[PDB]
Structures are given as C-alpha cells and as structure tokens.
Write a protein that binds this ligand. Structure first.
Ligand SMILES: COC(=O)c1cccc2[nH]ccc12
Length: 220
C-alpha cells in the first residue's frame, strides 16, 4: 500500500516531516519534561480519525501507556476544539497500560489481534502509540551488567513494532528521552513555543519547525 501520512496539526511540523508522520514507519520523538511529545501524541490520536482531506486516515488508534500520561480529558478537548465528537473520538482509542517492560512487549505482540480484527473495516488501526518506549527498560535494567539484555529486548520490541507498521500499514509513534526510526527532538523555544528538529533522516533534510500547544493540541 502507498505510504499514508497523518497531520501533526502543525503545518510547520508537517512540512519538516514531508507531510506528516508516515504509515509503515516508526516515528520516535525525544524530549524532556514539558517538551510537547505527549501533547503531540494526543493530537495525532485525534487527527488520524479525520478523513485524508482533513489530515487523517479515517483510522482507529491503539495506545500503550507506560507511565500514566494518557489524558482522556485532553483527547476530548482536542476533539471538540477541532469540531469532532469527543465521545466518538475516545471510543476509537484502544487504551492499554503497560506495567513493566515484559508486559509492554507482550502488549505489542498481542495488539496484532485487534489490528487483524479491524483491518478490513471502516476504521482500521492506523496509529499505534507507545508512550514511552523506554521508561520501563531504563527502570528495570540498571548498570552495565544489564545493558546487553536491555538492548536486545528493546531491539526485539522495535522489530515487532516495525513488523506491525509494515504489514498492516500503520503509523507507529513512540516517545523517548535522550533507521530503525525517524528521530525528532523537541525542545523549548521562545515565549512558550516548542521547536522540533529532525535528525539523521535518510531521505528528508534535517531542519527545524516551530510550533505551539493550544486547546487544539499541536498547531503552528
Ligand atoms: C482496549 O485496548 C486494548 O485491548 C489494547 C490496546 C493497546 C495494545 C494492546 N495489546 C493488547 C490489547 C491492547
């Protein structure tokens, strides 16, 4: 299938990304606390439900939350401020809490079932979020005796995510803190604006996009 793109809500950021985040890809967004990465996640979970003409893929969402950062009320706000029905938008985000790194890996594996179920329906899964990719791995695998296993488990986890993205035409979006992924680094700009910098993309120029966080989520 042709690569689809989901608008981030920001024209500036979309331009930097070549149109939006891609299906058949893992977009990995880095940032310190308050960077906007989770706000971007919340915005994408609404945007993807729109028709292509409005920046979406008429899709549903699966959301794996490792540190209790998903806010249903924020989804409702973004949905309503963008003219959608907040209750409908929430119903199409399948939520899972991951309690530890093993569980997180299992949740990605088990996600394939729902993906298959929805595949040839009116609302196929088009966005799979892991927020965040590494919090559990960082907590559980301490020091150098644990590095080898941490990297191997993380590598397998990313491989599983890649397979789902490619096989089922899904945009995978993961957050992190400092191929195989498209890496975007968020930082604070001036006057409460945020800045995204794209780094090491094989076929997109490096660059920056300035964006705002509003009642609509992310926008210029
Ligand atoms: C209701 O949401 C789920 O069941 C779910 C969401 C994200 C990943 C998942 N993996 C298995 C179930 C599941």
């Amino acid at each position: 299938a042709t690569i689809g793109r989901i608008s981030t809500g920001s024209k500036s950021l979309d331009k930097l990304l070549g149109g939006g985040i891609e299906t058949q890809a893992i977009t990995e967004v880095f940032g310190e606390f308050g960077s906007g990465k989770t706000q971007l996640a919340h915005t994408l979970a609404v945007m993807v439900q729109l028709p292509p003409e409005e920046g979406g893929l008429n899709g549903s969402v699966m959301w794996i939350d490792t540190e209790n950062t998903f806010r249903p009320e924020r989804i409702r706000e973004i949905a309503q401020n963008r003219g959608l029905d907040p209750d409908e938008v929430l119903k199409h985000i399948a939520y899972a809490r991951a309690f530890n790194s093993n569980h997180q890996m299992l949740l990605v594996q088990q996600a394939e079932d729902m993906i298959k179920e929805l595949l040839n329906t009116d609302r196929p899964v088009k966005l799979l979020i892991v927020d965040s990719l590494t919090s559990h791995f960082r907590s559980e695998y301490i020091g150098r005796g644990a590095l080898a296993e941490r990297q191997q488990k993380l590598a397998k986890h990313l491989a599983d995510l890649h397979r789902l993205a490619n096989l089922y035409d899904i945009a995978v979006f993961v957050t992190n803190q400092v191929s195989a992924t498209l890496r975007v680094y968020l930082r604070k700009g001036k006057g409460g604006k945020r800045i995204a910098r794209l780094i090491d993309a094989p076929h997109l120029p490096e660059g920056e996009a300035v964006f705002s966080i509003t009642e609509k989520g992310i926008e210029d």
